[PDB]
Amino acid sequence: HHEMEKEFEQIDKSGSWAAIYQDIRHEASDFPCRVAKLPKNKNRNRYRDVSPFDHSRIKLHQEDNDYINASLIKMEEAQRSYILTQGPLPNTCGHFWEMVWEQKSRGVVMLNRVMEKGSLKCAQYWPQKEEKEMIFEDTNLKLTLISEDIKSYYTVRQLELENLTTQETREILHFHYTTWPDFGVPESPASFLNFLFKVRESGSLSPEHGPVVVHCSAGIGRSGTFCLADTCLLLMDKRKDPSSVDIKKVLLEMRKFRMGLIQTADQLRFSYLAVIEGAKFIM
């Protein structure tokens, strides 16, 4: 039994977020990342210090080079899986969609804007115009924009992904959270939570499909907040006593699948806030 809310207020009052966060960084498990560090894969990694562990990395179905900086996070008790990956690089957009195709994912969750504070955070990996398809010649995939629905805090697009070898097509939902602040974290978790609920209602997180693909720039900070909040809320609804859910233990378990999830104390505090408010709204 825990008291997340009381604990939260106490950490706030004592100014202990950095200490709490350091405990998590120190207790986090480590696993080999040999494939990610191979010389041939250097240009497939956005950041030299953010790599997928070998045990949980997603493998592309190709003989030449099966590497992509993406990780499968499987939450057993919560019964949910997610693929967390970095924002596509100019040379890995074809790989990204190859992964979406091979894993039979129904949705992609994007938590960054292509350009933020004058810095390119990821490539423009989907077409912005319906009449201008995108062809990924290296992985034999074509992507066409079917619809775009822009809302205040996020945009939902439907994309048609076509396998150029077989002509089979699939529709992918792209849920783009477009308002994460340039500095810090959102002051209120309301919009983030509403976005999470839209993704849940979309079927993108359902077991009838391959795992949702979630990304931000590195695929560990904002992406970690999204999956941590979702899994914690899933556990609070499942268990007999929602107060028994330990957010720190849940984060440590997710970190066994991808390193560095939650990159700052502010993101850890925001994750707590989102789970606390999301729990209330749900119950």
Domain ranges of the chain: 1-283
Indicate the resolution in Å.
Answer: 1.5
What gap in Å lies between CA 70 and CA 238, rounded to an integer?
28
Q: What angle do CA 28, 31, 35 make, to 5 degrees?
A: 140
CATH code that applies to domain 1-283: 3.90.190.10
Q: Which residue positions form the known binding site? A: 182, 216-222, 263
DSSP states of 222-247: HHHHHHHHHHHHHHHHHSS-GGG--H
Annotated binding site for substrate: 182, 216-222, 263
**Whole-angstrom Cα distance, residue 204 to residue 184?**
27
Structure tokens at 221: 């900070």
* Cβ partners under 8 Å of residue 132, min gap 6: none
Asked if 142 contacts 98 with a C-beta cutoff of 8 angstroms, the reply is no
CA distances from 168 to 46, 62, 133, 142, 210 (A): 31, 19, 16, 11, 17
> Is 216 a known active-site residue?
yes
Q: Which position among 33, 216, 227, 232 bears the catalytic label?
A: 216
